[PDB]
Ligand binder design. Structure first.
Ligand code: HEM
Ligand code: HEM
Ligand SMILES: [Cl-]
Ligand SMILES: [Cl-]
Lengths: 181, 181
């Protein structure tokens, strides 16, 4: 199954440390996030919100970037990666109506997304889910997990991304910080 | 709603003229195709099959290409566009694991998909839907409609595309030919 669901409420494998409502309407603070590999139609009881998305193909990265990533990126579920952060993102209509070279140019040529992210590996593990195509309120669910040593660096990464040309098109962002139970 | 559904069976706005099972396991012949702008979980009565997909953002076209397409491409549901073809396509795992430069190059540099397709506009109208990400048996639903004067041409276009480098990656294909009721 390529589909993943995230349920904020009173049960789950993760503990909510905090939520930062960076841009746009936020998400309700909850005790725990429950993550599931499937669609969930039946909104669980005592649960405040459901996010979902699917794993998909590569949209921007070229072969050499891929090769560079594969050489250093960590797997998910390292025993040390006890912190995680879920970050929903929505981009503007003006971004989606742009052609594929335009978007590529802003993503790497101008914003150096891949080159910048590479500096935070192998400390940081990541997964990218897509959800615009499902009619969700957000366009993406981004997932990061790392050992505590790296929390500082990760915060530094967030502030860099948010200073890029790419982030000018971002109209909605929440940080959900988590601790593995 | 970005989601479109296509049900083969005994009702619908389109009459099946023929089904050609070009490559891989085919689709059961039926009398009609019903086309709905939404999901359909409730498997309609006396229906052989259901295909669905969503409209999405551009994946390969650059801005100059988009401009050429917009100059000439016809709208859907022109009075004279009484013939239609629905063509589900699946591409190979080996296609999907390639990077974004690699697929772009096979699609346009080697295959000239857009340049070739542009020679058949404005006779032919088209819609493109994605569905690998929904877990369907096909990766794409393609939709073409035109007046009969253009049938021979459309047939020429199919044979050109299938000789392309792109089409070496196609592992499943069906043409459903239709007539508007
Ligand atoms: C930690 C290191 C990071 C690396 C190595 C990295 C790498 C990448 C790469 C290569 C892609 C393109 C995937 C594709 O071609 O489909 C991507 C997409 C994305 N990344 Fe990152 N990333 C990192 C961190 C982050 C962070 C911190 C955020 C947001 C807070 C973020 C947000 C995104 C988004 C939204 C996309 C999808 C872009 C779109 O389709 O418009 N990434 N990431
Ligand atoms: C009639 C003129 C045609 C034009 C102008 C045309 C144009 C295009 C364009 C510009 C794209 C790229 C969309 C993007 O960047 O997201 C595309 C994708 C596609 N076209 Fe065509 N097309 C035509 C005919 C056909 C035909 C006859 C077929 C199949 C029998 C076909 C199959 C496809 C498929 C499968 C894709 C998606 C490829 C992918 O995302 O991997 N096209 N078409
Ligand atoms: Cl990823
Ligand atoms: Cl289209």
């Amino acid at each position: 199954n390529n589909r993943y669901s995230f349920i904020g409420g009173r049960t789950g494998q993760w503990q909510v440390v905090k939520i930062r409502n960076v841009l746009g309407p936020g998400l309700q603070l909850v005790e725990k996030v429950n993550i599931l590999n499937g669609a969930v139609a039946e909104i669980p009881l005592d649960s405040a919100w459901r996010l979902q998305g699917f794993a998909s193909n590569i949209r921007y990265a070229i072969r050499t970037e891929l090769e560079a990533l594969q050489a250093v990126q960590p797997m998910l579920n390292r025993a040390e990666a006890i912190l995680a952060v879920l970050i929903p993102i929505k981009k503007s209509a003006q971004w989606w109506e742009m052609a594929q070279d335009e978007r590529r140019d802003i993503f790497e040529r101008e914003s150096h997304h891949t080159a910048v992210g590479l500096e935070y590996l192998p400390g940081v593990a990541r997964r990218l889910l897509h959800c615009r195509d499902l009619g969700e309120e957000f366009d993406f669910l981004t997932w990061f997990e790392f050992a505590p040593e790296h929390s500082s660096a990760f915060n530094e990464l967030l502030l860099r991304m948010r200073a890029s040309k790419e982030w000018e098109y971002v109209e909605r962002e929440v940080e959900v910080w988590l601790k593995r139970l």
